[PDB]
């Protein structure tokens with residue numbers, strides 16, 4: 001009779017045991033990341049593999065962040081940890097044939113492209129804002145190129161950390177060391193500073209000022225000007241003088257002495273009373 | 274019959290209490306697929322007893338492994354005209370923090386980190402890289418290299434203009450030495466300090482122009498200058514022992530006194 | 546009864562609802578907040594999304610490591626070759642008024658540390674390469690507040706045990722070049738040293754094995770520690786001390802003084 005209709009409901013309709021309720025669905029969905037944002041509490045691993053990932057500096061990357069339509073930073077990594085077991089950000093490449101950079105910054109804008117600040121510690125310690133090391137003997141550890149009209153390509157300022165004028169007496173703006181190989185080195189013949197102009201310059205090669213006043217320079221011809229009393233702990237070789245304030249050579253002195261001697265001996269030999 | 278019905282009423286799922294397939298798709302489409310998607314809000318990482326490691330291969334709250342894939346690991350791009358902060362920020366707050374903000378461990382055949390400042394429409398005072406330290410106990414920056422036949426740091430200044438005098442006020446390296454900005458009474462800091470702690474046979478300073486030696490300071494501190502030079506003051510030197518050595522006042526005075534003595538002796542003792 | 550019609554309306558059809566097994570298949574394709582492996586591109590396109598610049602809580606991605614060990618982010622590759630760099634930061638508008646990267650570091654080690662490992666063969670590549678085409682600004686700026694060190698410290702280490710191997714190397718190498726495309730020359734300087742506020746220190750101090758060899762003082766006077774040469778004339782002041790270099794004037798005046806004195810004695814002696 002109507003046992004047909006009841007059997008049809010028993011077959012056609014879904015058991016509550018064999019389907020998730022809306023409450024159970026919400027529990028399961030709430031464990032997944034929404035596209036509108038969320039909090040990840042474990043490791044998110046990216047392992048692209050035949051996934052169409054591109055190198056493009058606009059649309060590429062396993063992660064791409066495009067801030068063109070938004071305020072704010074693309075990415076922020078923050079820690080207030082007292083100590084920990086590794087750095088905040090690591091970039092690593094293992095193959096000697098790897099033919100791309102770890103990091104490329106392609107910057108247009110009106111401020112500094114990369115800005116690195118080491119804040120004042122409570123106790124001074126030997127640590128730097130930037131540490132660069134290379135073990136490649138075929139290349140300069142670091143390269144800088146600029147096109148400045150009226151500034152230095154590299155600008156270094158040393159500021160006295162203290163109000164007292166003698167406090168920084170052992171400091172320098174630039175400090176250079178030249179060392180032998182650490183493990184078993186027999187010495188070194190490396191140079192301190194090498195300056196060239198491959199195409200040739202009209203400028204001074206070295207210009208030293210103090211309170212904006214010229215004190216010492218080396219010109220494009222290699223001649224120097226020194227602004228005060230100076231010393232050579234040794235002999236100085238120079239050209240024979242042709243002007244009043246030119247340094248006299250031993251030859252010039254000896255020739256003038258011999259000329260006077262000859263002239264006087266002649267007068268002495270020939271005078272009469 | 275009322276038993277069979279009651280059983281249906283209990284065992285079967287209500288339409289109000291279950292999502293349809295259409296509603297399931299709507300809800301799933303709001304969640305990120307492992308195969309990729311577009312996130313439009315903030316993704317926050319807050320690991321906490323989560324087994325996060327420092328390993329430079331498998332560590333990180335985010336780990337990107339590009340070993341089996343072309344492309345960049347990460348790209349941050351903006352075409353915004355202006356904005357309220359930098360693209361990427363790394364920040365550590367504790368002065369006891371004992372790791373770097375960024376570590377680059379590079380093997381390869383090109384430059385590990387490469388920073389380019391493109392030509393602006395109008396020149397302005399901005400840099401590719403700006404470094405500042407307020408730590409008096411350490412050098413703001415350190416560089417170490419092992420070059421066979423190059424500089425550890427190579428700086429090139431290129432004239433921005435075709436005209437040869439345009440860059441006459443520029444330099445490759447510019448150094449300033451200043452007093453403390455707030456209330457400083459002065460400074461005794463040095464410009465350039467060059468040493469060889471282990472000792473070098475090389476020239477300490479070598480200056481060339483068109484690849485030709487013009488001026489140098491040797492490993493012993495002796496200098497060679499390639500043209501006419503000036504001291505606005507006296508120069509102290511050793512007494513000359515060779516023809517082109519500069520003569521001292523003493524050498525001149527001794528030679529004058531020697532001649533004087535010899536002549537006065539002849540004058541005193543001649544007879545007619 | 547038509548309680549059967551009410552069951553037909555109130556209850557869900559099996560065809561129109563996912564089973565628990567089908568739900569799990571679909572959920573397993575989505576990222577859990579507890580972690581997982583993404584195998585495609587994750588794109589961030591915030592747009593009126595409340596993204597902030599804050600260096601603590603901002604970013605389209607924010608990683609806070611305050612309550613966890615480990616690194617925030619690791620980018621790793623063991624690829625032999627590839628078609629672009631691991632990480633790229635790019636800004637396109639010349640009006641852009643923020644940095645690409647800002648590091649705000651407190652701590653007791655190096656804020657940024659860049660290492661180029663020993664390659665299998667030497668090649669011309671660097672740990673860091675900096676280039677600017679902005680003529681209005683220094684390509685690079687460094688400021689420090691060192692008590693007793695250099696603001697920039699450069700060390701050259703001999704790559705080889707043999708002492709003459711690195712004879713062409715330097716710690717600092719400077720070149721001064723004309724514009725590559727059509728440049729007629731340059732007047733740029735090599736090294737420019739100043740103290741705008743004025744310093745009592747030596748402007749240039751050169752040592753070898755920690756011993757002073759050559760220096761330029763704050764007044765511009767120099768000291769050289771060994772025999773030296775000028776391929777040219779040296780202009781100096783007239784000497785007033787025994788070891789001062791004599792000028793041509795000093796020599797000529799002393800010669801003329803002796804000459805006069807002798808001619809006078811010669812003119813006036815009797816015997």
Ligand SMILES: CC(=O)N[C@@H]1[C@@H](O[C@@H]2O[C@H](C(=O)O)[C@@H](O[C@@H]3O[C@H](CO)[C@@H](O)[C@H](O[C@@H]4OC(C(=O)O)=C[C@H](O)[C@H]4O)[C@H]3NC(C)=O)[C@H](O)[C@H]2O)[C@H](O)[C@@H](CO)O[C@H]1O
Pocket residue numbers: 104143144145383384387389427428429630669674675676720
């Ligand atoms: C300092 C100095 O004088 N060094 C000499 C060295 O000159 C340098 O050459 C490099 C180089 O070409 O390898 C120059 O760097 C290039 O700079 C441009 C911007 O001007 C930059 O775009 C290049 O980066 C590439 O850019 C792009 C892109 O789409 O624009 C994509 C790539 O991912 C990226 O790598 C950059 N090239 C590299 C490889 O970094 C630098 O400006 C010069 O100073 C010279 O090559 C050698 C010759 O033997 O001598 C050195 O002394």
Ligand SMILES: CC(=O)N[C@@H]1[C@@H](O[C@@H]2O[C@H](C(=O)O)[C@@H](O[C@@H]3O[C@H](CO)[C@@H](O)[C@H](O[C@@H]4OC(C(=O)O)=C[C@H](O)[C@H]4O)[C@H]3NC(C)=O)[C@H](O)[C@H]2O)[C@H](O)[C@@H](CO)O[C@H]1O
Pocket residue numbers: 150151152155441442443444447449732734737
């Ligand atoms: C070509 C030549 O020899 N000119 C003679 C001139 O010498 C030049 O003096 C100028 C000067 O001081 O006016 C020097 O220009 C300075 O160069 C440095 C390094 O490139 C640069 O830092 C100076 O800029 C100042 O510093 C900074 C900064 O960020 O460090 C910013 C400001 O722009 C400024 O405060 C730059 N100064 C200027 C004003 O351009 C140049 O290097 C020297 O060659 C000499 O002084 C006079 C004779 O008294 O004759 C000229 O012919």
Ligand SMILES: CC(=O)N[C@@H]1[C@@H](O[C@@H]2O[C@H](C(=O)O)[C@@H](O[C@@H]3O[C@H](CO)[C@@H](O)[C@H](O[C@@H]4OC(C(=O)O)=C[C@H](O)[C@H]4O)[C@H]3NC(C)=O)[C@H](O)[C@H]2O)[C@H](O)[C@@H](CO)O[C@H]1O
Pocket residue numbers: 087126131132133177376415416417654655658660698699700
């Ligand atoms: C420029 C100069 O002369 N500085 C002197 C300074 O020497 C520098 O010492 C640092 C150092 O050890 O603190 C050297 O930096 C180390 O370089 C190695 C590569 O040779 C690099 O691997 C280190 O990084 C660590 O590496 C690893 C790893 O697994 O390999 C893990 C860590 O996360 C990472 O930190 C790097 N060390 C640091 C702390 O950055 C640098 O090469 C030297 O030039 C010397 O120590 C002091 C002594 O008073 O004097 C300075 O003048």
Ligand SMILES: CC(=O)N[C@@H]1[C@@H](O[C@@H]2O[C@H](C(=O)O)[C@@H](O[C@@H]3O[C@H](CO)[C@@H](O)[C@H](O[C@@H]4OC(C(=O)O)=C[C@H](O)[C@H]4O)[C@H]3NC(C)=O)[C@H](O)[C@H]2O)[C@H](O)[C@@H](CO)O[C@H]1O
Pocket residue numbers: 191194422423424427712713714715718720
């Ligand atoms: C030890 C000594 O005194 N040698 C005498 C020699 O002086 C040397 O000259 C060489 C030379 O010019 O060949 C100098 O080598 C140059 O050094 C600089 C600094 O390290 C380096 O940049 C040069 O490399 C070239 O430069 C660049 C660059 O990017 O800057 C690109 C070129 O492709 C690259 O090869 C380097 N030149 C070479 C070829 O190695 C060295 O510094 C000087 O000491 C002197 O010229 C002769 C004649 O009197 O006698 C020798 O004994």
Ligand SMILES: CC(=O)N[C@@H]1[C@@H](O[C@@H]2O[C@H](C(=O)O)[C@@H](O[C@@H]3O[C@H](CO)[C@@H](O)[C@H](O[C@@H]4OC(C(=O)O)=C[C@H](O)[C@H]4O)[C@H]3NC(C)=O)[C@H](O)[C@H]2O)[C@H](O)[C@@H](CO)O[C@H]1O
Pocket residue numbers: 111112115117155156157359398403404405449647686687688
């Ligand atoms: C001598 C020299 O090397 N350059 C001279 C130059 O001095 C430099 O000025 C910059 C600058 O203010 O532009 C100084 O950099 C600032 O450093 C502070 C730390 O002391 C840092 O906080 C600034 O960054 C900002 O910081 C913050 C923040 O919340 O703290 C937020 C911003 O996002 C961030 O940008 C940094 N300012 C910058 C990068 O703009 C630098 O220390 C000085 O050496 C001087 O201005 C000019 C004068 O014409 O001459 C140069 O020669």
Ligand SMILES: CC(=O)N[C@@H]1[C@@H](O[C@@H]2O[C@H](C(=O)O)[C@@H](O[C@@H]3O[C@H](CO)[C@@H](O)[C@H](O[C@@H]4OC(C(=O)O)=C[C@H](O)[C@H]4O)[C@H]3NC(C)=O)[C@H](O)[C@H]2O)[C@H](O)[C@@H](CO)O[C@H]1O
Pocket residue numbers: 169170171172175463466693694695698
């Ligand atoms: C002010 C003055 O003229 N003093 C004379 C003095 O010369 C000074 O010598 C000191 C010295 O050697 O003690 C010099 O201090 C050195 O300066 C450099 C550059 O800033 C610095 O690197 C040295 O630090 C050593 O170097 C490093 C390093 O990483 O570079 C690591 C070591 O741990 C570190 O200590 C620094 N040396 C010290 C010990 O502070 C200073 O620059 C010179 O001006 C001269 O020696 C004597 C001769 O009798 O007279 C004084 O008046």
Ligand code: NI
Pocket residue numbers: 271273543545814816
């Ligand atoms: Ni007589």
